[PDB]
Amino acid sequence: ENPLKRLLVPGEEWEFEVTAFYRGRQVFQQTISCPEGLRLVGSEVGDRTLPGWPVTLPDPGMSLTDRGVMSYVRHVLSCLGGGLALWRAGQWLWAQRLGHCHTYWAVSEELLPNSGHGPDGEVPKDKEGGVFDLGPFIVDLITFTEGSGRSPRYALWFCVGESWPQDQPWTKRLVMVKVVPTCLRALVEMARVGGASSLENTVDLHISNSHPLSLTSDQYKAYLQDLVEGMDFQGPGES
Amino acid sequence: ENPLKRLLVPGEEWEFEVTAFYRGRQVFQQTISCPEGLRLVGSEVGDRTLPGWPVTLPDPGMSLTDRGVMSYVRHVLSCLGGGLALWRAGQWLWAQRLGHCHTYWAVSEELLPNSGHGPDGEVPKDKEGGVFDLGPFIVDLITFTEGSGRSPRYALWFCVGESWPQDQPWTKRLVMVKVVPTCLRALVEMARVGGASSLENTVDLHISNSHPLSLTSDQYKAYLQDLVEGMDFQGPGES
């Protein structure tokens, strides 16, 4: 009876908002839904040959003037190949770099992350790599509704560099693509808005075959608690 | 020429979305249009006796269980009389309390936040009282499209209490009614979506005798700039 468990029902499709930035400037945005997820590509020639919805990054000639940056971005569109794949399987979001560009990822806020101290890791090519687990996110969301914890992050940032092994793209972050599972942005909003008001709030999970839901703060909290029973959490001493 | 000025053409009719809440729970929703505005009432025996479209608030019997709360709400429905009147005249939204219930108002978010703050004021009965001015809204809206300001608020909240002067309804907020001029909700979103793609965007003003509009961010911004000239803004030290 938990409406939130729909997030994990077999066949449910999440909506992914993709926003691209060249040198920190937004040059593209598209929201997609696909069972096999999506693939960030630079060319449409070999668009739908592989599984996953192809999202084509635009030629920089239509957004910037800096020739030095323009050259780099075109080199990146060139190594993309099959592309950066991102998809969901259960409570996990997986990524895999199918082309030739060294691509790095990080979970962060909705703002383009600055250099800081590096990305969370490099997206693997030989095998899939886990980049987000809904379990800990929901646990942290529950903690947020209790005031003892801040708003949990849900934005995935992918820094795409060249095929060259020496290139250190995270430093300048010239090609950045944010992917936001809109259901997670909504869950945080529901918590942020609903928690500060006694009035019933409405939530749109932005998932397939679903309608917005009006819930009181106590109902939402009880549903988050039960949703936790719908996911895996590894024990300290468990294999 | 400027399609947005249709919002102010003589005879034009805006659509108002009315949503009522009892003890924080949504119990009614209706969208209405009428040149003489609307009137929130508790009985249908004295509806169409005064100008304004009567919007009847429902018996709490088919939504509430707490006897304490139900008694209070029924008392409120009993003082409404002529009702809470809300209507538009040019760029202003006016309200007047024709019945006996002390009624307080506030312009806020789509969901009214709880706070130690009082209402923006009490709706007067002796005369009409201004509750919303499109002028400042549009100016703030423009500031918003420039990233130099937050998204302007457009949701009107009316807290309806009993006739008793001692009653402090704004504290428990048992009977709340939200009124949203959907054209304003649409204008704010346009300012948000327009920033996602410089191309064409559709904005439905939800007003009479008018088709949805197809505009670009540049056109929308220019029309907002010109719309300002169609409204009054009191100058410093002006009568």
Curated annotation (Swiss-Prot), chains A, B:
The modification Phosphothreonine is found at residues 49, 56, 65, 216. In the absence of viral infection, maintained as a monomer in an autoinhibited state. Phosphorylation by TBK1 and IKBKE disrupts this autoinhibition leading to the liberation of the DNA-binding and dimerization activities and its nuclear localization where it can activate type I IFN and ISG genes. Phosphorylation and activation follow the following steps: innate adapter proteins, such as MAVS, STING1 or TICAM1, are first activated by viral RNA, cytosolic DNA and bacterial lipopolysaccharide (LPS), respectively, leading to activation of the kinases TBK1 and IKBKE. Changing residue 100 to S: Decreased interaction with TICAM1. The modification Phosphoserine is found at residues 197-198, 208, 210, 239. The modification Diphosphoserine is found at residue 198. Changing residue 125 to S: Abolished interaction with STING1, MAVS or TICAM1. There is a cross-link at residues 5, 172, 178 (Glycyl lysine isopeptide (Lys-Gly) (interchain with G-Cter in ISG15)). Residues 12-172 are annotated as: Interaction with HERC5. Expressed constitutively in a variety of tissues. Changing residue 97 to Q: In IIAE7; loss of viral infection-induced phosphorylation at S-198; loss of viral infection-induced homodimerization; loss of viral infection-induced transcription factor activity; unable to activate interferon transcription in response to viral infection; decreased IFNB induction upon Sendai virus infection. It is found in: Cytoplasm; Nucleus; Mitochondrion. Constitutively phosphorylated on many Ser/Thr residues. Activated following phosphorylation by TBK1 and IKBKE. Innate adapter proteins, such as MAVS, STING1 or TICAM1, are first activated by viral RNA, cytosolic DNA, and bacterial lipopolysaccharide (LPS), respectively, leading to activation of the kinases TBK1 and IKBKE. These kinases then phosphorylate the adapter proteins on the pLxIS motif, leading to recruitment of IRF3, thereby licensing IRF3 for phosphorylation by TBK1. Pyrophosphorylated by UAP1 following phosphorylation at Ser-198 by TBK1. Pyrophosphorylation promotes subsequent phosphorylation at Ser-208, leading to homodimerization of IRF3. It comes from the Eukaryota. Changing residue 178 to R: Highly diminished ISGylation. Key transcriptional regulator of type I interferon (IFN)-dependent immune responses which plays a critical role in the innate immune response against DNA and RNA viruses. Regulates the transcription of type I IFN genes (IFN-alpha and IFN-beta) and IFN-stimulated genes (ISG) by binding to an interferon-stimulated response element (ISRE) in their promoters. Acts as a more potent activator of the IFN-beta (IFNB) gene than the IFN-alpha (IFNA) gene and plays a critical role in both the early and late phases of the IFNA/B gene induction. Belongs to the IRF family. Monomer. Homodimer; phosphorylation-induced. Interacts (when phosphorylated) with CREBBP. Interacts with MAVS (via phosphorylated pLxIS motif). Interacts with TICAM1 (via phosphorylated pLxIS motif). Interacts with STING1 (via phosphorylated pLxIS motif). Interacts with IKBKE and TBK1. Interacts with TICAM2. Interacts with RBCK1. Interacts with HERC5. Interacts with DDX3X (phosphorylated at 'Ser-102'); the interaction allows the phosphorylation and activation of IRF3 by IKBKE. Interacts with TRIM21 and ULK1, in the presence of TRIM21; this interaction leads to IRF3 degradation by autophagy. (Microbial infection) Interacts with rotavirus A NSP1 (via pLxIS motif); this interaction leads to the proteasome-dependent degradation of IRF3. It is linked to Encephalopathy, acute, infection-induced, 7, herpes-specific: A rare complication of human herpesvirus 1 (HHV-1) infection, occurring in only a small minority of HHV-1 infected individuals. It is characterized by hemorrhagic necrosis of parts of the temporal and frontal lobes. Onset is over several days and involves fever, headache, seizures, stupor, and often coma, frequently with a fatal outcome. This is Interferon regulatory factor 3. The lineage of its organism: Eukaryota, Metazoa, Chordata, Craniata, Vertebrata. The chain holds residues 189 to 427 of 427 of the full protein.
